[PDB]
Structure formats: C-alpha cells, structure tokens
Nucleic acid binder design. Structure first.
Ligand SMILES: C[S@@+](CC[C@H](N)C(=O)[O-])C[C@H]1O[C@@H](n2cnc3c(N)ncnc32)[C@H](O)[C@@H]1O
Ligand code: SF4
Ligand SMILES: [Mg+2]
Ligand SMILES: [Mg+2]
Ligand SMILES: [Mg+2]
Ligand SMILES: [Mg+2]
Lengths: 398, 326
RNA sequence: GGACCUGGCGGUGCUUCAUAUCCCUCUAGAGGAGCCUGUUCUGUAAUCGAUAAACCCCGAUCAACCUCACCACCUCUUGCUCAGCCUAUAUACCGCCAUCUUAACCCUGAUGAAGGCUACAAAGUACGUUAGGUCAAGGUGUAGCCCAUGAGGUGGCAAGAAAUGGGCUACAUUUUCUACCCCAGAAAAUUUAGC
C-alpha cells in the first residue's frame, strides 16, 4: 500500500508541479510507437526478396505462435512427483499427455530467415523499451561496451546503437548458430554479403567468454535464456553474465508465465550472492521494473509483463501496428540511488469517469489495486495517475 | 423518407455568368415584373433594360453584374415554380457559387428580396473599391496529375518579392473540380504562371474577365462595409439545406450565417467539396434532380466534371427564351 | 597397451539427372482530385473522446447549445426508493473462439560387440496448456465507492503541421441520352488476379 488516501502526496523534487505540466511527470516512461531504422528494414526486405510468398506468411505465424506458447523444460523432480501421483492414482503415456514436450530449435538457414522475419521488429521494440528505461532515468549514463548473449539478428545491437551510438565503441554478439551470425552480419551490411557495416565495433563470437576479468558496461539477454535446455544451463549463463556485467544487466523474455518465471529465477540468483570472494565485490539491486528486492508478489499465480507498441517491417502480412508483450528485469551494480523509490504500474490503467484504476507494485513488496479519485487522493495526484499509463512510475511519497 | 430521383437540388450561378439578354423568356411569367420593379426601387437604376439590352461592358462591371445575376436567379426560380410546382415543392438542398448564396438564402426564406438585394449591392461596390485599391486578377488553371498548386503559388510569390512589393498575394481561390482551380492575386504572379505553365505542368490557362482578386485577403476592405449591411438584416432559419462556400457544409443555425457570409468574401470558394457533400453516395444509388436556376450553364459543366452520374439528371432553366408564350 | 565394432558429425562440399512445391519470364487492371481513419511532432488547465444516448430522413454528415467524457470553480447528501454507479474482475468461474503439447518369432557369427540380400533367387517371415480474446445477440459469482467512483450547477474544451498506411466517391469517345435490345438519330512503384 503505497497510496493511503489523504496521507500520500505527490513527490515534488526539482520543483515539479510548479514548473511543468502533469503529462510530463518523471514517471512517464511511455515510449511512442517504435519504428525500426530504415537501414534495418531495407536489409530485412532485401534478404527476404528470395522467398516471401504465401508459404512464408504461414511459416512466420507458426513460428511466432510456437515461440509464444513454449513452456520451460520440465525439470527431473517435477516429472518424478507427477509420476508418483499418477502411479498412486500407462503412467508414461499419461505423462506424455499433460506434460509439455520441450525441443531444441536448430536454427539453420531457413529457420533463421523465418525467425528474423517473425521476430526482428518485436525484439527491437522490447529491447528499445528496456533501454529507454535506463536512458530516461539515468541520462548521464554513457556506456562504452556492450555484450549481448544470444544475439540472433542483432536487434539488441541496433537498439543500443539507436540510443547510445555517440558513446558505444564495442558490441560483442554471442550466438552458437553460424547461420544466425551470418544473417546478422548481412543485416548489418545493408542486406548484402559485401558492404560496409552500419554500426562500427561489432564483434561476432560463437562461444560465450567466461572470465571475470573482462567486464562490459551493458550486458543484455533478450529472448535467449528460454532457448537453454535446462535450469542448470540458465543458472550458469546468468552467473557468467552477472560476473561480466559492469553497470547494467538487462534480461528480456516473452510476456508469459514461463518468461516471467525465468526472469524471476535470474533476479533471485543475482540478488542472492553466493560467490565467496568475487573479483567485483559491488552488490546488485533491481533498477527496473521492480521498486524492491523482495520476492515478486505476483509470481504465485499470475505473471508480470509490459507492452510496447511498434510498427512492423512492411511485408505482405504486416499491415497494422502491433504490440510486443515482454517481461523485463534490469539489475544494476551498486546500491539504489535514493530511498524515494516509486511504485510501478504493471497493468493497463483504466480511465473511468472521475476515477482511474491502476495496479501498483509498491516498494514494500506488495501489489495494490488503487482506484484514484480527486476527492480522495488530491487533485495533483489524480491528474498524475490520469496521465500515467502501463509501465510508468507513480511519483508518490509517505 | 422519399427515394432520391423525385427530389430536387437548386444550383444558383455566380459572377461570370452574365450575358446580354437575361430576363427575356422570364418577363411574362408570373410575378417577375414586380421583382424587377423592386430592383429599380432598391438599386436606383433600371436593372431590367441593362440586363435585356446592354453594351455588355456596362453589364460586365462588378457593380452591375451581381444584382443582375441575383434578380435573374430569383426570376428563374419563379419560372421553374410555374412550369413544375412539384420540383420546388420537393427541394432538398440549395447552393450558390459566389453571389448565388445571397439568392439561395432568399430562396430558402432566410432573407427577403429588398434586404438581400441591398446586401448584394453593398458587397458589389465594396468589392469594386477593393479591386481599384490594388491591381489584381483571377486566373483559371487546369492542371495535370503532376501539377502542384501550392508550390506554383509559392514561386509566383518569390517573383513579386524579387520585384518588390508588400506581401504579394497568390493563392488558390476557387476549388471547381478535380485539377481545375482558380488562382487569385497580383497580376504579375499570374503572368508568371501563364508564362511558365510548362514547368508548372498546367495544361490550360485562361485569365478570367474580372475586376480584381476575389476571395483573397485583398478584399479585406470590403468585409467591414458588407458586415454593416448584414447587421440590420434579421436572418431566419433556412427552410431547405443551404450549403455554404467557406467550408462546404449546410448552414446549421441563423447565428452563424452572419459571419460566414462575411468570411466568404476573403476565403476560397469550396465548390468541389459542396458538390461532394450534396451528391456523393454509394455506386448504384439514384441521384436527385438538379436544376440550375439562373443565367448560363457553367455549374452544369462543373457538375459534369465532378460527378457524371449526378450530371445525368441535370437540367437548366432557360432564362433567354421561352417555348410557350404564357 | 593391442585388436575389432558401432558411432557421432541432423557437418562440409562436388557430379549427374526424376527435379514436383518455390521461382522468375509472360498476360490484364490498379498513382491525380475531394473527404474520412492509423502513427509521429508541436501545443492547451482540458478529450479535433463516444451516441442499444443527439440530430438530420434525398443519401450521408460536421461540429451539435442534446446528453455523456475532460479541465477550472462551487454546491449538496441522509439522500430515491435499507438509496446510487457498465466501476473492476472471464488476471473470478461456465459458454464460444483462438495458441501450443500429446513388437514377436526364426537363422548366421565358435549362441563376442554384432548381422540377416541375390527371382534361372543363396534365411528370413510376421486430454492437458494460456498473467490469451470475447460481458454486443449467453449465463453464476466475487469484490470497489456509498460527505462521493452518487446527484447537480457555472464557464471552458471544438487543437495545428507534415511524410507515409488504409478506406469512400466521380473519372468519356470501345463514351453519354432516346428508340430498340445489336443495320438508328442526336450530344460531346509495389500490389491484385492468372491455372
Ligand atoms: C532465437 S535467438 C533470440 C533472439 C535474439 N536474442 C535477438 O535479440 O534477436 C537466441 C539464440 O541464442 C543462441 N544460443 C542458445 N544457446 C546458446 C548457448 N548455450 N551459447 C551461445 N548461444 C546460444 C541460439 O543460436 C539462438 O539463435
Ligand atoms: S510484479 Fe513487481 S516485483 Fe514482480 S516482476 Fe513485476 S515489477 Fe518486479
Ligand atoms: Mg455516470
Ligand atoms: Mg465502461
Ligand atoms: Mg483473460
Ligand atoms: Mg470536445
């Protein structure tokens, strides 16, 4: 409960309410409809000129739905418990049913083309929103080094360029798939096998460097940890990425229960330090979206996700703007900047006559369903909530 | 709710439709002679003789053409009422081009002949004075798909800036039909368009025989007089849907006609939008009858260019001759 | 350490053809004008926001002084009726749609790992899942505010600019009107299919 009617008031630092309207309150983190850089869209369409017919539309739709509804691989112990329950109540067949068949996706050339056509714009939108979080809240940050695990098509690289190109000088892109690496190189070279890179300093590797000595300013993993075959693999990858994180570790997955569970495991892993004497002793905290380091109040039954609207790459099947629903967690080195941390709106805000419904993740670690009205909460706080939206912050104190 | 085809739309012409011989074929018809008698009483000169037999140079003057067109349009309305009462009874819309609005409103029971004629007169002398203030003119330009109008107006303006003049005027004045426009403003800009139509991609160009650049800000001096002439007038609610030219939509309440009729004087005429608002409909639906009450047949050609299917049911009231001597 | 066996490269290229899906080539139409929508930027204290709830009834329509929504001020309230509110929730269930997941025998090798074909024939034969949508032709619950998320009043609010995405109208000489239903008279770049 971060909104007590009649007690909580808007947080006015830097002389807010006097010097600037309500629509521009500092928790406004909404990003306008994302449009890809023209070079990237041109390269994608050129690379798909070969085969973009009716079959490709079906393949893209199938791949998108398959990835969206994919579950985490089931760990041994859960299968053991289910097997015991079924036996107490043939068992193997009943386990083939009511259990998800998780399979490795082998990204060959054809499946890489399909994945690019199906997910480039969506991934770019999600990563751009996650990066806008850091840019908006810490505008003095000028990263010089970026690593991106599971760099599929380079959407992370392109978003990082679009935001921090005047400071970034090294883009490490790790991906075990040679086809995916080749496609990323072609996309960076304007869709042609021979050309000059659009972004300078991009390094492509097939193996993840494992060494605490080398440390990047921004480490990213977008829709990548869900490809790993087991929780042990996810754990080791997240540990490596945190060890090599210099300032910010950005994890982005689908906006589903599976993606949110994966990200909450990663968040707990990073927050609970196990290493006895690490080379980098700085502690880690959650920069966004959580205003606390306590266990997620919403991991029990629901999930937590955020939406970013964007314009898809023009195709025979992409006509209208789309929404990208994604789960994010940003872990920052050091300690929280201050103690005036603000609730996060984790659900669409519903505007109704003279009241506003907002679901808040409060700094105390609990969810609050707040119906804000002028008479109860104050005109200024009501106006701030009225202009706020999904994924923003509400500037409230005491 | 009656099927369209038994309804009627009355179109009232504007300046440029004057001709020597208006009225002949209307005089013997009922009730026209006292309209021309009232025209004499209000104007101060015999409009009847000037319209019937004139040099055409006296008739082409701005002060004289507009009252002639107004009175002739109303007389043609009377003739149409005599021949076909059902057409006047089943009227759905009305629209005038520039001065025809003053006729259309009078036809709609929103203004009376005397006050409307006084307003038209004052408008005419005011516009003549505004034209005399500065050289200007109107140029009809027919463009092709590659023609750009705002662009061409722009270079026409830097031309006069290079020559040297305060805020040269050249802007599209009349929207008639697709790719046909009337530009208005200083004569030097119109000379520039006439001479380099080639780079302006204009298929045809024709200088209109008018006194000055109407429907531009050059007529600003004429706004204040006309406004006074309209303050005393008490405009009622039109009985039929009378369409405006400033924005090309129906006049809704009496409290806005007063200022719309003055804004028209310094705003472009939205004739194409008016035709679209009156006639546009799904393919296959029938169109209402259309009657051009007044001199000339220009609105007929404009309607043909705008909407051919609507033009199929178009007819004009003959104001120059009559088949049967009533 | 020696011998042998299965592998693993869902690997890499090169040769020829069957080479159907998929490709191109090819064929016929689709850019202008006027309105309406989608996104951005700028701007306002504020919404160019909606009519089982206006107006216009030739069609359709804009903002209407309808009313609701928003902004700035105020007023009530134990009141309508143990009052009042599409306020929320299908992220409550159920309905409906959609996403994804779902053998045996007989021989050979010394009864080693292991292997089993020849036709003029030589061991081979037999439901669950989803922070999913839908509260408009459908339901059962659960919660909210109840000196205000209820009821009123006084003013405002009625945006501006482009590049591009889409939609509707008219667009003619192989045309248009009349008579006839075919020998008459007057007027004047991608994209969509292909079969
Ligand atoms: C499908 S992409 C996800 C989208 C991509 N991260 C982006 O931003 O566009 C994830 C990639 O991670 C790679 N990957 C999976 N496991 C890996 C591993 N253990 N080490 C390195 N790369 C791995 C796969 O090749 C796969 O293509
Ligand atoms: S519900 Fe709150 S604590 Fe949980 S992931 Fe979302 S922001 Fe973080
Ligand atoms: Mg209400
Ligand atoms: Mg509602
Ligand atoms: Mg749902
Ligand atoms: Mg409004």
């Amino acid at each position: 409960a971060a909104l007590v009617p009649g007690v909580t008031q808007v947080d006015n630092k830097s002389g807010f309410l006097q010097k600037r309207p309500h629509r521009q309150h500092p928790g406004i983190l909404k990003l306008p409809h994302v449009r890809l850089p023209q070079a990237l869209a041109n390269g994608a369409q050129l690379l798909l000129l070969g085969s973009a017919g009716p079959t490709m539309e079906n393949q893209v739709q199938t791949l998108t739905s398959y990835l969206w509804s994919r579950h985490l691989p089931v760990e041994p112990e859960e299968l053991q418990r289910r097997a015991r329950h079924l036996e107490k109540k043939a068992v193997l067949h009943a386990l083939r049913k009511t259990t998800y068949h998780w399979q490795e996706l082998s990204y060959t050339e054809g499946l890489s083309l399909v994945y690019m056509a199906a997910r480039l714009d969506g991934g770019f939108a999600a990563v751009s929103r996650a990066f806008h979080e850091i840019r908006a809240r810490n505008p003095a940050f000028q990263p010089q080094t970026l690593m991106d695990f599971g760099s599929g098509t380079g959407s992370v690289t392109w978003a990082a360029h679009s935001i921090w190109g005047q400071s970034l000088r090294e883009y490490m892109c790790v991906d075990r798939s040679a086809a995916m690496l080749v496609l990323a190189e072609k996309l960076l070279k304007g869709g042609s096998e021979s050309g000059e890179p659009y972004i300078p300093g991009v390094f492509f590797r097939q193996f993840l460097p494992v060494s605490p000595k080398v440390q990047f300013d921004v480490v990213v993993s977008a829709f990548s940890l869900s490809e790993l075959p087991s929780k042990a693999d996810r754990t080791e990858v997240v540990q490596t990425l945190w060890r090599k994180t210099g300032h910010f570790l950005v994890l982005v997955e689908n906006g589903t229960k599976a993606g949110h569970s994966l990200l909450m495991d990663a968040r707990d892993l990073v927050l609970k330090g196990k290493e006895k004497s690490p080379l980098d002793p700085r502690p880690g905290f959650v920069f966004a979206p959580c205003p606390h380091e306590l266990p997620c109040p919403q991991l029990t039954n629901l999930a937590c996700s955020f939406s970013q609207a964007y314009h898809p790459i023009p195709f025979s099947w992409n006509k209208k703007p789309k929404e990208e629903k994604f789960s994010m967690v940003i872990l920052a080195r050091g300690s929280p900047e201050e103690a005036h941390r603000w609730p996060r709106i984790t659900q669409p805000v519903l505007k109704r006559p003279r009241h506003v419904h907002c679901h808040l993740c409060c700094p105390d670690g609990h969810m609050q369903h707040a119906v804000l009205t002028a008479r109860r909460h104050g005109r200024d706080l009501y106006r701030c909530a009225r202009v706020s939206s999904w994924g923003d912050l509400l500037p409230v104190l005491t | 709710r009656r099927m369209p085809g038994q309804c009627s739309v009355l179109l009232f012409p504007g300046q440029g439709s004057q001709v020597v011989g208006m009225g002949r074929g209307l005089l013997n018809y009922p009730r026209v002679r006292e309209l021309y008698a009232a025209a004499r009483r209000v104007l101060g000169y015999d409009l009847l003789e000037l319209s019937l037999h004139g040099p055409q140079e006296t008739l082409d003057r701005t002060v004289h053409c507009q009252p002639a067109i107004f009175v002739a349009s109303l007389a043609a309305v009377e003739k149409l009422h005599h021949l076909q009462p059902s057409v006047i009874e089943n009227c759905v819309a009305a629209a005038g081009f520039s001065v025809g609005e003053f006729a259309a409103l009078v036809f709609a029971g929103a203004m009376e002949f005397a006050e409307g004629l006084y307003a038209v007169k004052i408008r005419a002398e005011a516009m003549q004075e505004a034209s005399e203030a500065v050289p200007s003119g109107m140029l009809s330009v027919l463009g092709q798909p590659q023609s750009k109008f705002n662009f061409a107006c722009l270079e026409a303006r830097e031309h006069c800036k290079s020559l040297g003049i305060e805020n040269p005027v050249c802007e599209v004045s009349n929207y008639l039909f697709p790719d046909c426009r009337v530009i208005s403003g200083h004569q030097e800009a119109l000379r520039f368009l006439q001479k380099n139509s080639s780079k302006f991609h204009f298929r045809r160009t024709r200088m209109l025989p008018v006194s000055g650049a109407f429907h531009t800000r050059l007529m600003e001096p004429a706004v204040e007089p006309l406004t006074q002439a309209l303050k005393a007038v008490d405009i009622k609610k039109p009985l039929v849907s009378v369409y405006s030219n400033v924005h090309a939509h129906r006049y809704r309440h009496p409290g806005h006609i007063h200022k719309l009729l003055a804004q028209q004087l310094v705003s472009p005429v939205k004739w194409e939008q008016t035709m679209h608002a009156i006639y546009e409909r799904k393919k296959g639906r029938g169109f209402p009858q259309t009657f051009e009450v007044g001199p000339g047949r220009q609105l007929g050609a404009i309607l043909k260019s705008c909407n051919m299917q609507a033009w199929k049911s178009y007819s004009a009231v003959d104001v120059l001759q009559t088949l049967e001597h009533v």
